[PDB]
Amino acid sequence: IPRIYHPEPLTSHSHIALCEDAANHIGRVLRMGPGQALQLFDGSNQVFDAEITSASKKSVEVKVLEGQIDDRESPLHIHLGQVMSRGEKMEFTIQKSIELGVSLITPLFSERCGVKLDSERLNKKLQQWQKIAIAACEQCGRNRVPEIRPAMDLEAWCAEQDEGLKLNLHPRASNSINTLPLPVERVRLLIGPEGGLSADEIAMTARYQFTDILLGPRVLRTETTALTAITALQVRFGDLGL
Amino acid sequence: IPRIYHPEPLTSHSHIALCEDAANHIGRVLRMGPGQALQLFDGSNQVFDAEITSASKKSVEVKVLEGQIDDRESPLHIHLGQVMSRGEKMEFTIQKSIELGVSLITPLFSERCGVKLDSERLNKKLQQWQKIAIAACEQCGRNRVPEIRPAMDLEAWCAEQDEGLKLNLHPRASNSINTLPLPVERVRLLIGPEGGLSADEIAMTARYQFTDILLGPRVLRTETTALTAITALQVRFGDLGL
Question: Which family does the record claim for this protein (chains A, B)?
Fold first, then answer.
């Protein structure tokens, strides 16, 4: 049964019409009719049974049935600060991170991110990433949709007041996952760009009480370095081991 | 600033060309050039700033700018079932109804509608009415465009499964707007033809659990009877009082 996100708060026995991307996916790509099985959610951590009543071109109209809490969220809070990159790697990172239960995401600027975006082009990028978050939530069964926060400068993100651990990875780190002081329930995870963080930036994260960690003795691919780290955290402090 | 409907989904910073009726209205009737102020929408309940880049004969090409949600929709769902009539009254009814925030419209056949339309002539009529819906939306500032549903037989429309109230007007009705059980969030409103619904048709709407209502002690003109009823509903359960 297909999972659909609904950008407006859902209620038990209403009729509704799907947002445009949902109607396109269901009726225009999937050519489904009534046709009835759909499962819907809206970010409330609830999930609704629903029936395709009617369907058309541009248009798909359904009715929603019984609703219920279905919590696929990890009890660990992981806030990923991912330094932006010009390619198509940010998109894959968002998608996969969400599948691994990442709680919240802030795209970052740093000295070597190589991204130089105008206000509007960055707003557009952020909307697209929010759509990626939504689609990945449909796929992996999450019923909360993590926010893609507005982009931030590196240091400003580092400076944010927030309880919990602040981690960054470094091949010369003074800790590993297993030597981190317990318990761990909130983590801000900083992932830098391919060109890396500069010595000034490193020094600055230290001023902000970041703990840097080793992630094994092998060299990790940039592309996937976030995923690996998130997976480790989820396994050790989150639900991947439960 | 002129409001334009665009029959294709809109996006923030694209260039586009207006559909034919829009290009005719803007460049051929309004003789506008660049010339830049236009506001555009596409039924998503969003509205876009836009610039007439170029304009020609048959041709008007523009670029779209920032987009934003601008919700002029009533929170009350009113589905008008309006029995068809041969004159030019259906057109005025569609236009004005839309201006008053009617959610959805189904043109109906009944015993005394006096309309006997061939498939193709009825398809054509429905397209024209959909254009009226669009134009009225441009005018009144609505950013959703209500669907003119395919015409239906009276009883088949009555039989449709749909949560909410089902109303019809009768000078010997057993309720008024104010005696209707609360709350009211969805209404199907049946408006009959000038020759009226027959006793068999009345009896049949009762079988379908229609509630008939009085609409004041004066005799209402056929032409406008829909408008009056919609206005009342919008005032009492919708946004005309807010």
Answer: Belongs to the RNA methyltransferase RsmE family.
Euclidean distance between CA atoms A52 and A215, whole angstroms: 48
3-state secondary structure of B85: coil
Chain center to CA of B137: 9
Beta bridge partners of B152: B108
Q: Is A29 exposed, middle or buried (0-12, 13-18, 19+ CB in 10 A)?
A: exposed
Which residues of chain B form beta strands (DSSP E)? 3-5, 15-17, 37-41, 46-55, 60-69, 77-83, 104-109, 152-153, 165-169, 175-176, 186-191, 211-214
Question: Would you call A158 helix, strand, or coil by DSSP?
Answer: helix
B8 in contact with chain A, both atoms CB, cutoff 8 A: no
Indicate yes or no: CB of A120 within 8 angstroms of CB of B13.
Answer: yes
Inspect the interface and report whether the beta carbons of A120 and B66 lie closer than 8 Å: yes
Rounded to whole angstroms, how far apart are CA atoms B8 and A211?
50
- Report the C-alpha gap between A24 and A18 in whole angstroms: 9
**Burial class for B81, CB neighbours closer than 10 Å (0-12, 13-18, 19+):** buried
Q: The tokens of A115 are what? A: 């991204």
This structure was determined by X-ray
- Which of A188, A215, A209 shows the shortest CA–CA distance to A76? A188
Rounded to whole angstroms, the Cα distance separating A203 from A210 reads 10
Q: Which amino acid is at A232?
A: A
> What are the chain B neighbours of A124 within 8 Å (beta carbons)?
12-13
CATH number for the domain whose boundaries are B1-71: 2.40.240.20
**Resolution of the experimental structure, in angstroms:** 2.2
Q: Which superfamily does A72-242 belong to?
A: SPOUT methyltransferase, trefoil knot domain (3.40.1280.10)
Domain boundaries, chain A: 1-71, 72-242
Q: B44 CA to chain A: closest CA distance, Å?
A: 7
Contacts of B147 in chain A (CB under 8 A): 59
For residue B77, what are the contacts with CB-CB under 8 A and spacing of at least 6?
B103, B104, B164, B185, B186, B187
